[PDB]
């Protein structure tokens, strides 16, 4: 029955294939289907059918959409494939290539319907923009194509012409009245000056990028506070009080906790609010972001206690450290420092290995120079200490002979018996039974770490770096995608000043875009049809370039002169 | 000079003129532009620059994050703005080079000093102040995942992104300076034929022609110039044949050829 | 290169970057330097009429047509400059 097919398609995409069939509670069935192709490739497309499915995708209404509908079913289906053929079939399905050439073919020709393309609302989609369907299929190939991230380059600017210089850009930010000069240009489109001047105003203000910058500096203010407090005016407990610096470092935090819960609750429509809280925490930065606003709270708990007090302090100077890590999402905008990001995450995975091979190697030496060294050393944390701690500090020039040679001992007044050991009066006497034998483990392990080891984890870092630098180009684009709709959606005041912009927008929501449009129907019907004659021009296009191929006219030359 | 020639400037003047030393020192480099295998080493050392700024970013990142905390968790009671600045920024990226004075990170290591607690002793300078010791093995932790990523990741990333680096630039570095090149060579064909600080000579003696009174960019006669443009349009058409020729017997237009010929 | 600098269209600064004009010129030269060797110095420090009296080698400069300084008949020339009136093999 259909409903069967609906919770297939419900798995694969959960959100696109609402009302298909649901709609009527199943249609009529004599009734016509009322989008016959998209109903066919789909159908076409759950069972691994690709020749049948490029068919009908070719004679669709709307491609990229269904390409990357295509995309997405394929790639999920691979995961769920048995049979290894199959699996690899679906692997290689190239249908995320087909949106890439399409849009391609169709920004060469017009390059601004191209734009509305991209932002429009599909009928056949169930009003799912062609940038969400991306999203959905995690088309991190289709998001690097250069239309795409032009589009984003204008939203990104906003009213402001793209090639500003950076310059113009922060002279105007500080000095918020060269707004109304000439300094920076604009695209086009007694109480009227004030209307006027306000709009350009706001104009300027709502850019993203604008908002973005102010983000920056603020959270720059941030950290610079929270130093402050941290190392100079942290005063004990509520008994005495804690500094007017820490309770707006209280404040600050609190405004950042309501923008979190902004993102969280209240981002752009009314979704299922578990849905919705899934897709918040779905997000790596979102996480961050919640691991320091719960670090701060238990600082602050724990802060205004006495029995706690160097507790919450400690946990406050370790918060910092994430504050100070959050300021890496930043580097996504530019393209310098973008794809730096991505390719740190495949070098995490090559020092995993490099420290399974120096765990192995560093406890085997450590336990044994313990053992031939300190075997009469009964404290567990330094058995722990000279077993790890040392062996580990030998890989950044840390060796200190002084306690592993024999000759570079030196003459301190050290005891044997075990009591003594134990209080702690006087530092153990090493044992220098066979010391050339500890000197000997020392260099083969001075050896293998410093020189073997270091060296691969510098060929592994190499030849990962030379495999990764082509696809992170495509991930940083993804990421700046990212960055772009999410500074895009977010109010136009850094925090703490975000307080301002809540209230404003609870107020009017009490009392009362760029992507993701909706378009006439006359509009839609013609954007429609030049994406079908597009598609019709790039089919033909491959067409003739197979016909005039070199194998194809040595075969048709063959098949003649036979 | 000018501090130097006043008592009251005379140290700073000294100071300006040791750091202006450096500049004529590095503004030898042009010299060797004219070598080969010295030539692209300095186009190279360019690129390197950007990606010296990538980890930099990443170590002033990183790097703030570490000496922050550590100098929260270990001096919590130190005013000294100086101070905090030497062990949350100097410190750390002397750990970088090796540099791990593990005397004043480690509890064990550090030495039997006589340390102060008081604020005002500590601000006078009288003794140096007793480092705090709550929850050292959370900075001995600290300091080992900072010397993990620092030394390891970071250091070995920045070497894999000069390697990279290299290898891409390597083609065209070449290119560059054979412009470079080109650029040294016209300068020092420009130049008056004495070095300084005799060029004064030189000087006056172009001065004085001037008020008394090339091997590029030379004009030619008429016949010449008129024969020498003929001769660049005959090999500018024997160019082009060879282009159509080379066309016409490329693989593929023979196999069009064929296949119109053979329907 | 400046044109497509000053582009809007995507395609059109596209067709801009490849212009392949330079390449034109080296490959022009080449066979210039293959033929005589020596008209082609004269070529390249000849005072060209349709451009203002204005040498190639000045518009080379002008463009900034660094892969056609890397030429081996410009590098023979700046040689052959270098050495003045002494043997380049010296
Ligand atoms: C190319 C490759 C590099 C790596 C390697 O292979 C080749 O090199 C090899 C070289 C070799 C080493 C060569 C030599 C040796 C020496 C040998 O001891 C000989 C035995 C004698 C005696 O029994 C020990 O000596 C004496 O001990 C006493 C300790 O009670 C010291 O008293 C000190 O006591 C107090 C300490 O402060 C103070 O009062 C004074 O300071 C001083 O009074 C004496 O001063 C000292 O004289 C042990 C082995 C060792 C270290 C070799 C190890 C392996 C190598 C590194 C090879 C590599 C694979
Ligand atoms: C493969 C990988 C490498 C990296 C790592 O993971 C694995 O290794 C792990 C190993 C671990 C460490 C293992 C062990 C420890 C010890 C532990 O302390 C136990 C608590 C006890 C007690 O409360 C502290 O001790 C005592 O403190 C006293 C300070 O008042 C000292 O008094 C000194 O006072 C003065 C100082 O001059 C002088 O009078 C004398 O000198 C001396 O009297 C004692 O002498 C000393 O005994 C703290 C944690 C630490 C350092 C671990 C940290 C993390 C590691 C490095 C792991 C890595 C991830
Ligand atoms: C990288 C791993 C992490 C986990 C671990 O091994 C390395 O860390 C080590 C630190 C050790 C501590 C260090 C100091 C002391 C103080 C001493 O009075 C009692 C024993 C105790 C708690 C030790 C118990 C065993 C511990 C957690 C070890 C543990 C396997
Ligand atoms: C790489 C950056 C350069 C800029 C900067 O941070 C690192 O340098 C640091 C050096 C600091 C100095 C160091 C020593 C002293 C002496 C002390 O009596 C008063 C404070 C003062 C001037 C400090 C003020 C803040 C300064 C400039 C910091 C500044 C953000
Ligand atoms: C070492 O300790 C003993 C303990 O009695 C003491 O007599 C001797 O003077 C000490 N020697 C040193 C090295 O100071
Ligand atoms: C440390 O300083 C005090 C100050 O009175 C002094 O009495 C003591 O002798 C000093 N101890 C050392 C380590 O010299
Ligand atoms: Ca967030």
Known sequence: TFHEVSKVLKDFLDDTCKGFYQKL?????????????????????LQNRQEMAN????????????????????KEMAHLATEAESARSMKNAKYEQFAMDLFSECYSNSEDRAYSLLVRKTCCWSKATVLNIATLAEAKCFFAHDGVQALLTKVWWGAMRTDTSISRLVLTFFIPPLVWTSLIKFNPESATFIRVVLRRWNRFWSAPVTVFMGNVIMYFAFLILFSYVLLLDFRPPPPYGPSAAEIILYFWVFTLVLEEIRQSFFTDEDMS?????????????????????????????????????????????????????????????????????????????????????????????????????????????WVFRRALYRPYLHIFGQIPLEEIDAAKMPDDNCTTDV??????????????????????????????????????????????????????????????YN????????????????????????????????????????????????????????????????????????????????
């Open 483 to 562: 960055l772009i709709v999410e500074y895009h959606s977010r109010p136009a005041l850094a925090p703490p000043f975000i307080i301002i912009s809540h209230i404003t927008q609870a107020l009017l929501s009490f009392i009362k875009d760029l992507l993701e449009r909706e378009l006439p129907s006359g509009l839609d019907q013609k954007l429609m049809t030049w994406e079908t004659v597009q598609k019709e021009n790039y089919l033909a296009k491959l067409e003739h370039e197979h016909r005039e191929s070199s194998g194809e006219r040595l075969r048709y030359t063959s098949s003649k002169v036979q």
């Open 273 to 381: 609010i578990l849905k919705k809280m899934k897709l918040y925490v779905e997000d790596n930065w979102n996480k961050c972001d919640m691991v320091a606003i719960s670090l701060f709270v238990v600082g602050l708990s724990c802060r205004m206690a006495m029995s706690t007090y160097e507790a919450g302090r400690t946990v406050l100077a370790l918060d910092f450290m994430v504050f100070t890590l959050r300021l890496i999402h930043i580097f996504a905008i530019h393209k310098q420092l973008g794809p730096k990001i991505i390719i740190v995450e495949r070098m995490i995975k090559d020092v995993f290995f490099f420290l399974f091979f120096l765990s192995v190697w560093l406890i085997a030496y450590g336990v044994t120079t313990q053992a031939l060294l300190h075997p009469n050393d009964p404290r567990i944390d």
């Open 25 to 45: 509670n199943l249609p009529d069935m004599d009734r016509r289907c009322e989008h016959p192709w998209r109903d066919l490739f789909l159908w076409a497309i």
């Open 55 to 74: 068919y009908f995708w070719a004679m669709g209404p709307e491609a990229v959409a269904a390409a990357l509908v295509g995309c997405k079913i394929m």
């Open 419 to 480: 009591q003594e050991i134990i209080l702690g009066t006087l530092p153990p006497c090493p044992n220098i039974y066979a010391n050339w034998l500890v000197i000997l483990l020392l260099v083969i392990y001075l050896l293998v770490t410093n020189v073997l080891l270091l060296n691969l984890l510098i060929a592994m870092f190499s030849y990962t770096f030379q495999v990764v630098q082509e696809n992170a180009d495509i991930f940083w684009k993804f990421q700046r």
